[PDB]
Amino acid sequence: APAVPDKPVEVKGSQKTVMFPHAPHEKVECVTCHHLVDGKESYAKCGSSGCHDDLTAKKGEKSLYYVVHARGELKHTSCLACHSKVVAEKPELKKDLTGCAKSKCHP
Ligand code: HEC
Ligand code: HEC
Ligand code: HEC
Ligand code: HEC
């Protein structure tokens, strides 16, 4: 694989950018997030062309918002899906990991 980013990286939506830190995710398998595509590894940006390249819609597979924020049933684990499980076990982190405002994603 390519080297994991060693600093927070931009995740660009259509109007907001959220910084994503790899370090707290070191125990998460890369493929949880960088899931296989057509049975092959890929580490391309989630919003690249042909992937989750609808940066304005809130719903549906092509939506970057949806694959980040859906709490619902998805074929891969979303940020908010996993974080909901983490905060169940570490409730002190509820706002940090799941808040829509004043969270670590949206400070
Ligand atoms: C989800 C919790 C992740 C885990 C686990 C890993 N990465 Fe990641 N990575 C993730 C995101 C949301 C992003 C930003 C993507 C975007 O569209 O902006 C990244 C980015 C990278 C990159 C750079 C991609 C690019 O700019 O072309 C690389 C090379 C990368 N990630 C590698 C990587 C590896 C090797 C991991 C396991 C050691 C790994 N990531 C875990 C989300 C997540
Ligand atoms: C294009 C090569 C992609 C890249 C890069 C990323 N994703 Fe993706 N994703 C892609 C497809 C073709 C699909 C549908 C088939 C499948 O593998 O399930 C998905 C699916 C997801 C999902 C589930 C969506 C749903 O069930 O509606 C999630 C949560 C998801 N992808 C997340 C995700 C993230 C966070 C990515 C960057 C780290 C990412 N994908 C890259 C195609 C592609
Ligand atoms: C589980 C499979 C995860 C997925 C998918 C994502 N995150 Fe996560 N995140 C996870 C853990 C276990 C932790 C650490 C909690 C703890 O016990 O401390 C985190 C933490 C973050 C943070 C906070 C980091 C800090 O400020 O100290 C951020 C900003 C964060 N995660 C963002 C994030 C995003 C944007 C994700 C989807 C692209 C995402 N996480 C996925 C576990 C998991
Ligand atoms: C980190 C785990 C996040 C938490 C908690 C919340 N959001 Fe978020 N949000 C996150 C990312 C990685 C991004 C950028 C990628 C994308 O387009 O989704 C965003 C962006 C938004 C936006 C702007 C969308 C755009 O196209 O610019 C909105 C309006 C937004 N987020 C809403 C939102 C709400 C309502 C939240 C509480 C449920 C929330 N976010 C939490 C990552 C994270």
d(CA 34, CA 77): 10
Query: 102 among the known binding-site residues?
Result: no
Domain CATH number, residue 101: 3.90.10.10
Burial class of 49 by CB neighbour count within 10 A (0 to 12, 13 to 18, 19+):
exposed
CA of 79 to the centre of ligand 2 (A): 12
**What is the residue range of 4's domain?**
1-107
d(CA 2, CA 76): 21
Asked how this structure was determined, the answer is X-ray
Measured from the CA of 28, which atom of ligand 3 is nearest? 2
Q: For the beta carbon of residue 57, count every other beta carbon within 10 angstroms.
A: 13
Let me know: does 14 contact 20? Beta carbons within 8 Å. Answer: no
Pocket lining: 35 vs ligand 2, CB cutoff 6 Å: yes
Please tell me the total count of domains within the chain.
1
Query: 52 among the known binding-site residues?
Result: yes
d(CA 84, CA 98): 7
d(CA 99, CA 25): 18
